[PDB]
Design a binder for this molecule. Structure first.
Ligand code: SRM
Ligand code: SF4
Ligand SMILES: [Cl-]
Ligand SMILES: [Cl-]
Ligand SMILES: [K+]
Length: 538
């Protein structure tokens, strides 16, 4: 690699970071949008106030403003559902470590409630909240309301740092390695500039995902993150070994690889900054499918990339990885649904199943009520789109289990439901090829009616090749497609994936059978479960 390849391609100009004039040739259309107007100005210079007053029909009449609502607003966590819910916006938060409060939950519920049939909310595969139904004129007030309850939606979509994922059992599990909350909190504060915006990390070549590991279970899925912090002692000091480059895409799925770097615990933010600066400064900005950070690592080689991180560390120091980390390979992933004792004597947490992560305003209020009556007003989200309510005095559990809402959001649903994960799908998502959430519930219910089993089989349903529901991690995965019935009629289908493993012995699954009509999946899945997962016909 020539020395010229290492010239930073962006520069700071008036508080924002822009592509240098000599690096603008051949860039993709999204890069052109970012050059035409800095997206962060919508928040940091309050551009949203005037934009929100323009009728959407007028907005659509000029490229600049249409790009504002369809592209730039994703820097404020707002996602125009142009195709499938025209004029409405999904809104996505920062929620480091999946931690929310009852007050925040009620606030989000009050927002979606206003929108009636156009509103609802979802737990995401990054243990995050999305709300739906938002209209542009309400955006300024919603931004204010979020801030009032201690939430931000900054930099949650497009070419930004995604929600920092941590251990859902952080601080409460007798078996945790290290509480991940302080680190995910710090990362979120760094990324968003303490909820004011951080332009230094908002003009990346592409999305970028971080997680901090604190569980032997590896609930955080470090193998699929762009940066994963693996807890490790080195020379008698606590810190993290670093894995880099994990990502999924239609084109390519790759597990994270060692950077061959260890940092002391206090260097979590400095090294996040150094890696992001290297990616920002040096990453390809052509074909969007070749812009994720792993592509830069392949171009420079991992050592070449490492040197770029190192030069951007304070005092330009970056130690090599510790030979061992603290994660025990002898481990069985633990079910967190149901009632479990905390490390604090006399306290329990309860994991509740949220069917395909979907909730209405009334459901959110009820969950918030439970967290107040039984817990400490805290609700935690998980990457399987479930919830945990921690800090419940154990003597209260008997009463809790009798609460009517637990018949819907159950501490002990059937085993296949426990592991079921599904993306948004075509109810709202314009990329989706099929409907996912309703279909996956229906099929899973029919399958479980036919077979019993004891193995915790994890089924993931994703609506298109973007694989937001991570079919490549599933025991059985379903990727949306259109296919044909016996008469040659167009029908919704799924490509079925097998072979995904999580935890320390991770592995990426691959397509096993293409183009199966959705109406034909039940017998296929029943047979797979009996033949490969020890299921028994009822
Ligand atoms: C909500 C969520 C799925 C879910 O039901 O939980 C989702 C939703 C969408 N994703 Fe994603 N992604 C979700 C996690 C993921 C993950 C999984 C993960 O992070 O572990 C991936 C695969 C892992 C990865 O990217 O490395 C993922 C891969 C993408 C991709 C493909 C990325 C690529 O490099 O090609 C896009 C489209 C793109 O960027 O080209 C996409 C684009 C989208 C958009 C924003 C497209 C759009 O504007 O319509 C989806 C919004 C639909 C909607 O209305 O909800 N989404 N997306 C997840 C929100 C996470 C969060 O809170 O931030
Ligand atoms: S996998 Fe496809 S259909 Fe599902 S939310 Fe992501 S982009 Fe939409
Ligand atoms: Cl996005
Ligand atoms: Cl759309
Ligand atoms: K769920």
């Amino acid at each position: 690699v020539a020395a010229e390849r290492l010239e930073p391609r962006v520069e700071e100009k008036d508080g924002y970071w822009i592509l240098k004039e000599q690096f603008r040739k051949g860039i993709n259309p999204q890069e052109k949008v970012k050059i035409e107007k800095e997206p962060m100005k919508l928040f940091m210079e309050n551009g949203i106030e005037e934009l929100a007053k323009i009728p959407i029909e007028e907005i659509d009449q000029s490229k600049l403003t249409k790009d504002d609502i369809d592209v730039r607003l994703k820097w404020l966590g707002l996602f125009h559902r142009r195709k499938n819910q025209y004029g409405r916006f999904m809104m996505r938060l920062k929620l480091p470590n999946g931690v929310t409060t009852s007050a925040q939950t009620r606030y989000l519920a009050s927002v979606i409630r206003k929108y009636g049939k156009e509103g609802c909310a979802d737990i995401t595969t990054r243990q995050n909240w999305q709300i739906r139904g938002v209209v542009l004129p309400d955006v300024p007030e919603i931004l204010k309301g979020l801030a009032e309850v201690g939430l931000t939606s900054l930099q949650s979509g497009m070419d930004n740092v995604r929600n920092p994922v941590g251990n859902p059992l952080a601080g409460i599990d007798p078996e945790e390695i290290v509480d991940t909350r302080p680190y995910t909190n710090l990362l979120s504060q760094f990324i968003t500039g303490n909820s004011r915006g951080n332009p230094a990390v908002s003009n990346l070549p592409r999305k970028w995902k971080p997680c901090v590991v604190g569980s032997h279970d590896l609930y955080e899925h470090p193998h699929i993150n762009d940066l994963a912090y693996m807890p490790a002692t080195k020379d008698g000091r606590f810190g993290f070994n670093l894995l880099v480059g994990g990502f999924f895409s239609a084109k390519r799925c790759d597990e994270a690889i060692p950077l061959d770097a260890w940092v002391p615990a206090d260097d979590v933010v400095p090294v996040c900054r150094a890696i992001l600066e290297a990616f920002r400064d040096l990453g390809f900005r052509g074909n969007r499918q070749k812009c994720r950070m792993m592509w830069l690592i392949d171009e420079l080689g991992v050592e070449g990339f490492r040197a770029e991180v190192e030069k951007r560390m304070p005092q330009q120091q970056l130690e090599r990885a510790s030979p061992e980390d603290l994660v025990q390979k002898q481990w069985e992933r633990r079910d967190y649904l149901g009632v479990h004792p905390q490390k604090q004597e006399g306290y329990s947490f309860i994991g509740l199943h949220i069917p395909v992560g979907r909730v209405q305003a009334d459901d959110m209020d009820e969950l918030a009520r439970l967290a107040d009556e039984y817990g400490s007003g805290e609700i935690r989200l998980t990457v399987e789109q479930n919830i945990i309510i921690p800090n419940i005095e154990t003597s209260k559990i008997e009463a809790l289990l009798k609460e009517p809402v637990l018949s819907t959001f159950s501490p002990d649903p059937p085993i296949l439901m426990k592991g079921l994960v599904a993306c948004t799908g075509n109810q709202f998502c314009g990329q989706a090829i099929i409907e996912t959430k309703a279909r996956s519930l229906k099929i899973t219910e029919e399958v479980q009616r036919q077979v019993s089993l004891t193995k915790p089989v994890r089924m993931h349903w994703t609506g298109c090749p973007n694989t937001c529901a991570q079919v490549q991690v599933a025991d059985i995965g379903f990727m949306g497609c259109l296919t044909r019935d016996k008469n040659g009629k167009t029908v919704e289908g799924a490509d079925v994936f097998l072979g995904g493993r999580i935890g320390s012995d991770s592995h990426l699954g691959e397509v096993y059978k293409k183009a199966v009509p959705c109406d034909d999946l039940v017998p296929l899945v029943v047979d797979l479960l009996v033949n490969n997962f020890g299921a028994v016909p009822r």
